[PDB]
Amino acid sequence: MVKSGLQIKKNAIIDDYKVTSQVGKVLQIFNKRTQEKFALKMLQDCPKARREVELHWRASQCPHIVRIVDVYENLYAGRKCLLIVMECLDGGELFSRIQDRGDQAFTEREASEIMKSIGEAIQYLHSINIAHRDVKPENLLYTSKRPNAILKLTDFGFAKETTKYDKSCDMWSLGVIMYILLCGYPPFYPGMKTRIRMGQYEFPNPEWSEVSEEVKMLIRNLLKTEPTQRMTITEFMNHPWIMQSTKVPQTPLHTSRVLKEDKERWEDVKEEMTSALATMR
Ligand SMILES: *S(O)(O)Oc1cc(-c2ccc(C(=O)N(Cc3ccccn3)c3ccc(N4CCNCC4)cc3)o2)ccc1Cl
């Protein structure tokens, strides 16, 4: 129940890690004692930088959040820097994995399982009254390239402590990610297909025809316009579909085929989500 506080080391990082002065693109480095590989984490020391690291430190323990190993305050070309050491995440981004399946065969069940992984992260946070506020594709990365790897949430660069409705956009993000997992495109309104005509019903049939109302209902609750009426993390993780993924139909989703078809738009998807987030926060 009692966890230790953040200790930012002051001593030069290269006493501890092989870096080789090739040193915010993220770098692979090596612990000298253990010779293990890690990632790093280079920020501009600033009040804000510190609050995020703090918040991230309070969450590192969560199995579905990228762990901080060590933090250094060092001078890089006489710029005060936070160097943040974290475990390597070589698995890539959640949706890239899905898109690159050779057979292109993703199931409702797999979607359920993923969403539980992500839910867990958000539950850890929300219950210690932190809000992530930047839950999107680029921030969901896998440990290893392997089939049985683990999902970790990243970028605490919009986190903050939440004495309520700040948590709401974490849930709106859940809504969006869930929806994309289920069909391959976001629930947002040349050369390619239009997936959701403007103003039309939120679950188009080509890809949503075999998804149950139960699951459409869960999604409508996460995307609820009014935060006063949007699903909470407690409600989410208590929902049957999340709670019991093993009983979730292995419904063949269109997701992997669509992400491949609409690959040119992915930058655009991510940008529309990022824009949207800045108005929702
Ligand atoms: S920050 O707090 O923003 O969180 C964060 C963490 C990572 C992160 C942790 C571990 C890794 C990692 O090891 N790799 C692999 C790698 C490969 C080559 C050189 C260095 N590292 C990794 C994974 C993913 C990414 N990015 C690239 C930019 N788009 C998103 C994925 C870089 C490095 O990374 C990464 C990013 C963030 Cl924000």
Author numbering: 47 to 69, 76 to 215, 239 to 264, 273 to 364
Quote the passages of the study that discuss this structure, keeping the authors' original sentences.
We aimed to develop covalent inhibitors targeting tyrosine residues in the protein kinases JAK3 and MK2 using structure-based design principles to generate small sets of ligands containing tyrosine-reactive sulfonyl fluoride and the less-explored fluorosulfate warheads. By utilizing a structure-based approach with well-characterized kinases, we focus on Janus kinase 3 (JAK3) and mitogen-activated protein kinase-activated protein kinase 2 (MK2, also known as MAPKAPK2) as model targets. In conclusion, we successfully synthesized a small but diverse set of novel fluorosulfate and sulfonyl fluoride warhead-bearing compounds, initially designed to covalently target tyrosine residues in both JAK3 and MK2 using structure-based design principles.
MK2, a serine/threonine kinase activated by the p38 MAP kinase, plays a critical role in the cellular stress response, inflammation, and regulation of pro-inflammatory cytokines. While compound 43 (bearing a fluorosulfate next to the piperazine) showed no binding in our experiments, 64 (the sulfonyl fluoride analogue) showed 15% covalent modification of the protein and compound 42 (bearing a fluorosulfate next to the chloride) displayed an impressive 95% covalent binding to MK2 within the time frame of the experiment. To determine the exact location of the covalent modification, we solved an X-ray crystal structure with the most efficient covalent binder, compound 42, in complex with MK2. To our surprise, 42 does not bind into the allosteric pocket at all but rather occupies the ATP binding site where it reacts with the “catalytic” lysine, Lys93. The reason for the poor activity seen in enzymatic assays despite an orthosteric binding mode may reside in the relatively slow inactivation kinetics of fluorosulfates which may not compensate for a relatively weak non-covalent affinity on the assay time scale and under ATP-competitive conditions. Consistent with this, the measured kinact/KI value of 1.12 M−1 s−1 (see also the ESI†) confirms the low overall efficiency of covalent binding process, supporting the hypothesis that the weak non-covalent affinity and slow inactivation kinetics limit the compound's activity. Beyond the covalent interaction, the hinge binding mode of this compound is also intriguing: since the inhibitor was not designed to be orthosteric, it does not contain an obvious hinge binding motif. Instead, the carbonyl oxygen of the amide bond interacts with the backbone amine of Leu141, similar to the hinge interaction observed for skepinone-type inhibitors of the upstream kinase p38α,66 yet without the peptide flip induced by the latter. In our second tyrosine targeting study, unexpectedly, one of the putative allosteric MK2 inhibitors formed a covalent bond with the “catalytic” lysine, showcasing an unanticipated binding mode not just in its covalent interaction but also in the atypical interaction of the carbonyl group with the hinge region.
